[PDB]
Amino acid sequence: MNDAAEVALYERLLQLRVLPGASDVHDVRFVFGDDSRCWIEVAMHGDHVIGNSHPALDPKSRATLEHVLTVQGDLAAFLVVARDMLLASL
Amino acid sequence: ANENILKLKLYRSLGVILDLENDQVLINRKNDGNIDILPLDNNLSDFYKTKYIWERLGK
Ligand code: NA
């Protein structure tokens, strides 16, 4: 299959969609699940990588997420923790 | 480069690899010679497949 169809299968398997962010700054929006239920926006570059999220997260949580991305440099681990946090916040 | 090309690189960077030659998906979280292999069989629900994959990524 073509790239768009492979993208569609990843979205189905992970229930993870990668969308343009609303932010100029945090320009990647990760969307979890079947609706616009859980999402978090991030910047792929910089010190200040964590943007807005729905459910809003508290500062302690946002700092944890920031470090997985900036310090650990581990996108999968960041998505795992962010998904768990956002789902628990619903 | 186009947008899907990048999305695919991003998914792949998670260690999740489509192996459609074999009707399965591979999960390589540790890069240590061990992988999880998930059949794409209609048999398991989408919910079960998603839950399983996120469990593997969370290890
Ligand atoms: Na995008």
Side-chain angles (χ1 to χ4, degrees), chain A residues 18-21 27-29, chain B residues 3 6-7 10:
Chain A
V18 183
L19 266 45
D27 58 339
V28 181
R29 178 177 288 203
Chain B
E3 196 170 281
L6 311 183
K7 280 174 193 209
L10 187 154

Short mmCIF file of all heavy atoms in Angstrom, two decimals, chain A residues 18-21 27-29, chain B residues 3 6-7 10, ligand 1:
data_model
loop_
_atom_site.label_atom_id
_atom_site.label_comp_id
_atom_site.label_asym_id
_atom_site.label_seq_id
_atom_site.Cartn_x
_atom_site.Cartn_y
_atom_site.Cartn_z
N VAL A 18 -1.23 12.05 14.15
CA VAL A 18 -0.24 13.14 14.24
C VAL A 18 -0.81 14.25 13.37
O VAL A 18 -1.03 14.06 12.16
CB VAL A 18 1.16 12.65 13.76
CG1 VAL A 18 2.26 13.75 13.91
CG2 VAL A 18 1.59 11.43 14.52
N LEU A 19 -1.10 15.39 13.98
CA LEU A 19 -1.79 16.47 13.26
C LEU A 19 -0.97 17.76 13.38
O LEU A 19 -0.16 17.87 14.31
CB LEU A 19 -3.16 16.68 13.90
CG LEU A 19 -4.47 16.03 13.42
CD1 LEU A 19 -4.30 14.60 13.14
CD2 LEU A 19 -5.60 16.24 14.44
N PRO A 20 -1.17 18.75 12.46
CA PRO A 20 -0.60 20.08 12.67
C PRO A 20 -1.12 20.67 13.97
O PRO A 20 -2.31 20.57 14.26
CB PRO A 20 -1.16 20.89 11.47
CG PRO A 20 -1.42 19.92 10.43
CD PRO A 20 -1.93 18.68 11.19
N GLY A 21 -0.25 21.27 14.77
CA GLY A 21 -0.68 21.87 16.05
C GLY A 21 -1.47 23.15 15.80
O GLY A 21 -1.41 23.70 14.69
N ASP A 27 4.06 22.74 17.22
CA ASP A 27 3.41 22.54 15.94
C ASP A 27 3.01 21.11 15.59
O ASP A 27 2.45 20.89 14.53
CB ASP A 27 4.25 23.14 14.80
CG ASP A 27 5.67 22.58 14.72
OD1 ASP A 27 6.26 22.02 15.69
OD2 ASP A 27 6.23 22.73 13.61
N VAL A 28 3.31 20.17 16.49
CA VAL A 28 2.88 18.77 16.35
C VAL A 28 1.84 18.43 17.42
O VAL A 28 2.13 18.53 18.62
CB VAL A 28 4.09 17.81 16.51
CG1 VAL A 28 3.63 16.34 16.35
CG2 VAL A 28 5.15 18.14 15.45
N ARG A 29 0.64 18.05 16.99
CA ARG A 29 -0.40 17.64 17.89
C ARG A 29 -0.54 16.11 17.81
O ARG A 29 -0.80 15.58 16.74
CB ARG A 29 -1.75 18.27 17.49
CG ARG A 29 -2.86 17.78 18.44
CD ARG A 29 -4.24 18.40 18.16
NE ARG A 29 -4.28 19.80 18.57
CZ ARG A 29 -5.40 20.44 18.86
NH1 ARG A 29 -6.56 19.81 18.78
NH2 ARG A 29 -5.36 21.71 19.23
N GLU B 3 4.22 14.97 3.87
CA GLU B 3 3.76 14.88 5.25
C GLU B 3 3.62 13.44 5.74
O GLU B 3 4.02 13.13 6.85
CB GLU B 3 2.45 15.64 5.43
CG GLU B 3 2.10 15.94 6.87
CD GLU B 3 0.93 16.91 7.02
OE1 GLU B 3 1.15 18.14 6.84
OE2 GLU B 3 -0.21 16.44 7.32
N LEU B 6 7.01 11.74 6.58
CA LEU B 6 7.46 12.12 7.91
C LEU B 6 6.69 11.40 9.03
O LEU B 6 7.30 10.87 9.94
CB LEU B 6 7.34 13.62 8.10
CG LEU B 6 7.95 14.50 6.97
CD1 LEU B 6 7.81 15.96 7.33
CD2 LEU B 6 9.40 14.16 6.59
N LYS B 7 5.35 11.41 8.96
CA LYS B 7 4.51 10.59 9.87
C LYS B 7 4.99 9.14 9.96
O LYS B 7 5.09 8.58 11.06
CB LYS B 7 3.04 10.62 9.40
CG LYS B 7 2.30 11.88 9.80
CD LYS B 7 0.91 11.91 9.19
CE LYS B 7 0.30 13.28 9.33
NZ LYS B 7 -1.19 13.24 9.42
N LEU B 10 8.15 9.00 11.90
CA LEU B 10 7.82 9.16 13.29
C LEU B 10 7.27 7.86 13.92
O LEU B 10 7.72 7.46 15.01
CB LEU B 10 6.82 10.29 13.47
CG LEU B 10 6.46 10.72 14.88
CD1 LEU B 10 6.00 12.22 14.83
CD2 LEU B 10 5.36 9.80 15.50
NA NA C 1 1.90 16.77 11.09
#
